[PDB]
From Swiss-Prot:
Disulfide bonds: none annotated. Residues 8-48 form the UBA domain. It comes from Homo sapiens. Testis specific. This is Ubiquilin-3.
Length: 54
């Protein structure tokens, strides 16, 4: 980090954000479940996200 608060799942969120995961709220929870792991989260986020919903 270079001058700026230290978030929990920032970097991890960053990527997600790019992927189109504009659901930090969900991403977080997921990230929490996994423990920060993004790849894993994704695998979850994807699953969680029903067939066209959100």
């Amino acid at each position: 980090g270079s001058s700026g608060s230290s978030g929990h799942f920032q970097v991890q969120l960053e990527q997600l954000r790019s992927m189109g995961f504009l659901n930090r709220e969900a991403n977080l929870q997921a990230l929490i479940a996994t423990g920060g792991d993004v790849d894993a989260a994704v695998e979850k986020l994807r699953q969680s996200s029903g067939p066209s919903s959100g």
